Amino acid sequence: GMIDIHSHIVFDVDDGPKSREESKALLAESYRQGVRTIVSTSHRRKGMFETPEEKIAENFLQVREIAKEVASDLVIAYGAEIYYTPDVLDKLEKKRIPTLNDSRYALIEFSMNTPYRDIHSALSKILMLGITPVIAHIERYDALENNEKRVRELIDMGCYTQVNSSHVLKPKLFGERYKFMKKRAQYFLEQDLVHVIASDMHNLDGRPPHMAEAYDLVTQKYGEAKAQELFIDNPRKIVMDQLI
Amino acid sequence: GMIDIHSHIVFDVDDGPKSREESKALLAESYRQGVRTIVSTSHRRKGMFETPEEKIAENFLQVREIAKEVASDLVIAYGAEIYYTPDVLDKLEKKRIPTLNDSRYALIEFSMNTPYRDIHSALSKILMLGITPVIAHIERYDALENNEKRVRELIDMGCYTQVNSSHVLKPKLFGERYKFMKKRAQYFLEQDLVHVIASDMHNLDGRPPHMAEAYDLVTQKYGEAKAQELFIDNPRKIVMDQLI
Ligand SMILES: [Mn+2]
Ligand SMILES: [Mn+2]
Ligand SMILES: [Mn+2]
Ligand SMILES: [Mn+2]
Ligand SMILES: [Mn+2]
Ligand SMILES: [Mn+2]
Ligand SMILES: [Sm+3]
Ligand SMILES: [Sm+3]
Ligand SMILES: [Sm+3]
Ligand SMILES: [Sm+3]
């Protein structure tokens, strides 16, 4: 029973599901693949994802009703994926934006080419609030490309890393769009710099969950024990508000 | 990975472990049997279990450190087993006594021969506080012996039932001390009146966890699906603060 801590399943709030039907379909697929817990982390990002918090709550609650139709033992928790801009700090401290399952952990996102010093500075200011940043899809940031020294630094301040399930997969030979993130992801896993693997699922045409598959690949390359850590135990600790 | 929502693992606080050594030994056994989550529910009972709440917290936190020695993926949550006396209501509402994992659920206990009207009255007054009572070892109460009508009533007010793992086991032919609770437990399982099975573990000489075994017996008699509900899914919902 996997716990997916990064998901876009709330409808009409961001670039995830546009309808209830689409939300129900996502949940169902996630369930097929063995996920029994999903943390909703819709986008909060000044400039492009500014849906009112009240509306996200409204729709999330509806999605939690829908989950019941998929399966009685599917647990939906609230949360958020937060794109760092300065305003975000007070919003977090005052609790106007959710942490993951109301725990100490917050899912934090940057741009592909955010300079390292900006990522670092931002993550410091969040730690100052007593909140623990889990860094969203570290494969994305150029700042961290092939750079363990920098990732260790962040982990050692008190951050934890998340990698997307789809970037654990192997590169295709025709029509690959994520060569660099797949290469980057594989490097972090080799260096043992990954705490969590999550789906970042948005839909069932382009951004599905690849959790079942990502799990079998990590099992083979890195061992069953590591797959369980990244896909179950560490997420378990996050959702239970305990330090990993 | 089972979740045990009823446990006496804090030392020098009640009739559970008397030492750290004994606490560590309990955790370890529970882990052997496949339990990955344990809710601490030490005794709060006017008249015989009156250890100051500050002291229970102090020692619980230490037990949570010890758990790390047993295994990194063992999660210890705080809670309490509450013996109903009137004072308990305000203590709960004001939060001077913990609910299970700080959820809406509280583990509630009575005496073997508490008349039904007293159990009922007490459980009403707790529901009035917005708290959901999970009834501790229902096998114990004479009021509920062979009496589905009464158990359904309670469940329908909004209570949930817990049965002890050791009372799921088969009766012995020499030196059985729990014939009646084993018979009673078996009856509730047949009538499908049990939401949760938990250990009520106190030690490793007389009151061990019988979770591994209780799980295999429920599997055989009632199906894998039911064992998972009682030993994993329903407890999962309790610890995640979601209505079962
Ligand atoms: Mn998106
Ligand atoms: Mn993102
Ligand atoms: Mn995302
Ligand atoms: Mn006891
Ligand atoms: Mn008891
Ligand atoms: Mn007990
Ligand atoms: Sm290295
Ligand atoms: Sm490691
Ligand atoms: Sm019946
Ligand atoms: Sm049932």
Domains of chain B: 1-244 (3.20.20.140)
A88: left (phi over 0), alpha (psi -120 to 50) or beta: alpha
B242 touches chain A (CB under 8 A): yes
Within 8 A by CB and 6+ apart from A92, the residues are A82, A99, A106, A126, A129, A131
The order of strands in the sheet holding B75-77 is B2-4, B35-39, B75-77
B229 touches chain A (CB under 8 A): yes
Assess contact for B201 and B8: CB atoms under 8 A: yes
The token duo for A190 is 């080799």
Unique residue bearing structure tokens 């949550």:
B77
A225 touches chain B (CB under 8 A): no
Do residue B240 and residue A73 have CB atoms under 8 angstroms apart?
A: no
For residues A131 and A129, give the distance between their C-alpha atoms in angstroms, rounded to a whole number. 5
Nearest 5°: phi and psi at B151? Answer: -65, -45
Nearest 5°: phi and psi at A20? Answer: -60, -45
For residues B19 and B37, give the distance between their C-alpha atoms in angstroms, rounded to a whole number. 21
Q: How many residues does chain B have?
A: 244
CA distances from B134 to A30, B185, B204, B232 (A): 30, 16, 25, 15
Assess contact for B133 and B123: CB atoms under 8 A: yes
Classify B8 as helix, strand or coil: coil
- Experimental approach was X-ray
CA distance to partner chain B, nearest, from residue A12 (Å):
25
Buried b (16+ CB within 10 A) or exposed e, A44-58: bbeeebebeeeebee
Map chain A to HEC letters. Answer: CEEECCECCCCCCCCCCCCHHHHHHHHHHHHHCCEEEEECCCEEECCCECCCHHHHHHHHHHHHHHHHHHCCCCEEECCCEEECCCHHHHHHHCCCCCCHHHCCEEEEECCCCCCHHHHHHHHHHHHCCCCEEEECCHHHCHHHCCCHHHHHHHHHHCCEEEEEHHHCCCCCCCCCCCHHHHHHHHHHHHCCCCCEEECCECCCCCCCCCHHHHHHHHHHHHCHHHHHHHHHHHHHHHHCCCCC
Assess contact for A108 and A84: CB atoms under 8 A: yes
Which amino acid is it at B206?
G
Degrees (nearest 5) of the Cα angle B36, B37, B40?
140
- Ligand 4 centroid to Cα of residue B40, in Å, is 12
For residues A122 and A143, give the distance between their C-alpha atoms in angstroms, rounded to a whole number. 14
> Nearest CB to B75: which of A101, A228, A237?
A237
B237 touches chain A (CB under 8 A): yes
For residues B181 and B164, give the distance between their C-alpha atoms in angstroms, rounded to a whole number. 9
Which amino acid is it at A37?
T
The token duo for B188 is 């509730």
For residues A154 and A151, give the distance between their C-alpha atoms in angstroms, rounded to a whole number. 5
Assess contact for A194 and A161: CB atoms under 8 A: yes
| DSSP letter, residue B150 | H
Listed residue (B63, B71, B72) closest to B32, CA to CA: B71
- Ligand 3 centroid to Cα of residue A39, in Å, is 11
Which among A63, A73, A101, A229 is the top mutation candidate for probing chain B, defined by the most B β-carbons within 10 Å of its own β-carbon? A73
Residues facing residue A163 across a β-bridge: A197
Name the residue in chain A with its Cα closest to that of B225. A73
Q: How many residues does chain A have?
A: 244
Residue B72: CA atoms inside 13 Å, Cβ hemisphere, count? 9
